[PDB]
Target: cGMP-dependent 3',5'-cyclic phosphodiesterase
Amino acid sequence: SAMDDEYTKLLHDGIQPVAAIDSNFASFTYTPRSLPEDDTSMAILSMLQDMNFINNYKIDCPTLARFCLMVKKGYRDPPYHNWMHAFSVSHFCYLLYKNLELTNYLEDIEIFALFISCMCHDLDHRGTNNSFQVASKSVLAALYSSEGSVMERHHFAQAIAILNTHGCNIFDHFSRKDYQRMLDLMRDIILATDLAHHLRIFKDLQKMAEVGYDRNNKQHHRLLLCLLMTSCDLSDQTKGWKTTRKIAELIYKEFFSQGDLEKAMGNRPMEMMDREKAYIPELQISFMEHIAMPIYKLLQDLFPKAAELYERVASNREHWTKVSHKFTIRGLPSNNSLDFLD
Ligand SMILES: COc1ccc(Cl)c(-c2nnc3c(C)nc4ccc(C(=O)NCC(C)C)cc4n23)c1
Ligand SMILES: [Mg+2]
Ligand SMILES: [Zn+2]
Model:
């Protein structure tokens, strides 16, 4: 058994200090996708230890090791929505913890729930979106289409199934109230990763940042968790140009594959899913200006120390404008041939 030996080492070898992973591991400039995939489960444990969650919540180490491996094994391998995405999203949550004084805003258990939700938030993603579940009449749509956020409901359900697997419930010593609270938080945070949900609550996020965060307002806690979750989910946009470029390639590979499946079903894909129509520079610039930048602007509004994140998203978007011309074939192609016109 592969997992058996990995677990044995994860449990008995001990947890490496975060600085041994990388000297800049806790910096906004660090790219967690640089970490070898084989080192990521150990890194998850290192972060959990460094954030004091293991000690504070007296988490059972064998259970935690099993849980971490089960979560990793709970991702498939589409180009983008894979374990390295969940890992990098979890890492950014850790960065927010290390850089932004979250304990002035959120309860301990909320910060814990955010991180665990990050690990779990895309579990068993098949590389297709919510619309496709309904159009393809998938099992997931049969279960959840009446509620909406089909994939995100599945991700949450998958997280619960892992918890309900013997030897994996890292919360099973919790008081009844804390257990209920944790699972309720995971529901809210994972369901908040549906961009439709973000767009619905965006006005509320703005009003929150306008009036100023009120740590005594429970709805403010809820809203901030949603924003932070979204900030983690999109955090590839806050690194360098190379990260944005590669993640664009991964996402559109995933998108265009869905589009191919939609065409074969006799449906016409969204433009951004259609490899014959999608003009990537326009599409990325649009996503950055209309989705990613406003999120990190709000984050900056609430946390001044997060200004560098917004400025690098803006910087990355500007670089897309600058390379857009490259999508136009000047002169002859690659191979000196016009055969592709046929
Ligand atoms: C947070 O939940 C998700 C779920 C899935 C994805 Cl792929 C993303 C996500 N993460 N990075 C990206 C980038 C770089 N570009 C994207 C361009 C479009 C869309 C998309 O789904 N647009 C449809 C809607 C806006 C009408 C998502 C994009 N995205 C986030
Ligand atoms: Mg998702
Ligand atoms: Zn995600």
About this structure: Residues 1-342 form a domain with the Catalytic domain of cyclic nucleotide phosphodiesterase 4b2b fold (CATH 1.10.1300.10). The pocket of magnesium ion (ligand 2) is lined by residues 121-122, 193 (CB under 6 Å). The chain has one domain: 1-342. The radius of gyration is 21 Å.
